[PDB]
Write a structure and sequence with these properties.
part of a larger assembly; 2 chains; A: about 0% strand; B: about 70 residues; about 0% strand; viral protein; HSV2; Portal vertex; Complex
Chain lengths: ~45, ~70
């Protein structure tokens, strides 16, 4: 049991931590471009 | 002052909403100058506000010249 299942605890955690960063790459990449959305509208706000 | 005028799409913050004015004034208190002064000698919220400060003096002397020559 410690060879068959223990070849799988290697490969259950492997997929379940690739999928968790993909929640955090949605959030840490547009809150840098929302400041770009602030400044690009701010160029006409100068005008 | 950008995002309160960018999310509200207020192109010039003298067209800012009266609650949207004072809520920013409740946040940052040094903005009573460029929002609540009757005739500030420096123009509020313009890029050439220092340049338009100069061009008046260029104008106001020429009338002081031009009506004195007459």
């Amino acid at each position: 049991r410690r060879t068959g299942r223990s070849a799988l605890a290697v490969l259950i955690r492997a997929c379940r931590r690739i999928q968790q960063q993909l929640q955090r790459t949605r959030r840490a990449l547009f809150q840098r471009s929302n400041a770009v959305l602030t400044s690009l509208h701010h160029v006409r706000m100068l005008l | 002052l950008t995002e309160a005028c960018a999310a509200e799409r207020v192109v010039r913050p003298h067209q800012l909403s009266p609650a949207a004015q004072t809520a920013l004034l409740r946040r940052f208190p040094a903005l009573e100058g460029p929002l609540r002064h009757p005739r500030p000698v420096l123009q509020p919220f313009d890029i050439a506000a220092e340049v338009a400060f100069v061009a008046r003096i260029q104008i106001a002397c020429l009338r002081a010249l031009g009506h004195s020559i007459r």
